[PDB]
């Protein structure tokens, strides 16, 4: 999914990222999430849904 | 029945029948029970 300019979208359990925005991965190979949180995403490239 | 891999962010309880002791196991890991040990119910989200 991509969001166009002047638009936004909310995805529950946002991606936990490092200081450079690189997705942090768990020891067992899982993706580091932020449980029970919502994030606002503005116009950018078509990110994937983890 | 013997093989029980719980999904990520879940747990199960397996009873040690040789000690009457119950325990919980967490983490996205595959779990195999013993003959004496018996799981009580299927995984539900933690």
Curated annotation (Swiss-Prot), chain A:
Tissue and organ distribution: Present in most normal tissues. Higher expression observed in epithelial cells with secretory and excretory functions, as well as in cells chronically exposed to xenobiotics, such as bronchial cells and cells lining the intestine. Overexpressed in many multidrug-resistant cancer cells.
Q: Where in the cell is it found?
A: Cytoplasm; Nucleus, Nuclear pore complex; Cytoplasm, Perinuclear region
Recorded protein name is Major vault protein
The function of this protein is: Required for normal vault structure. Vaults are multi-subunit structures that may act as scaffolds for proteins involved in signal transduction. Vaults may also play a role in nucleo-cytoplasmic transport. Down-regulates IFNG-mediated STAT1 signaling and subsequent activation of JAK. Down-regulates SRC activity and signaling through MAP kinases.
Sequence ranges of the MVP repeats: 7-50
Q: What is the gene name?
A: MVP
How it assembles, according to the record, is: The vault ribonucleoprotein particle is a huge (400 A x 670 A) cage structure of 12.9 MDa. It consists of a dimer of half-vaults, with each half-vault comprising 39 identical major vault protein (MVP) chains, PARP4 and one or more vault RNAs (vRNAs). Interacts with TEP1. Interacts with PTEN and activated MAPK1. The phosphorylated protein interacts with the SH2 domains of PTPN11 and SRC. Interacts with APEX1. May interact with ZNF540.
Q: How is it modified after translation?
A: Phosphorylated on Tyr residues after EGF stimulation. Dephosphorylated by PTPN11.
What triggers its expression? Up-regulated by IFNG/IFN-gamma.
Give the domain note.
MVP 3 mediates interaction with PTEN. MVP 4 mediates interaction with PARP4.
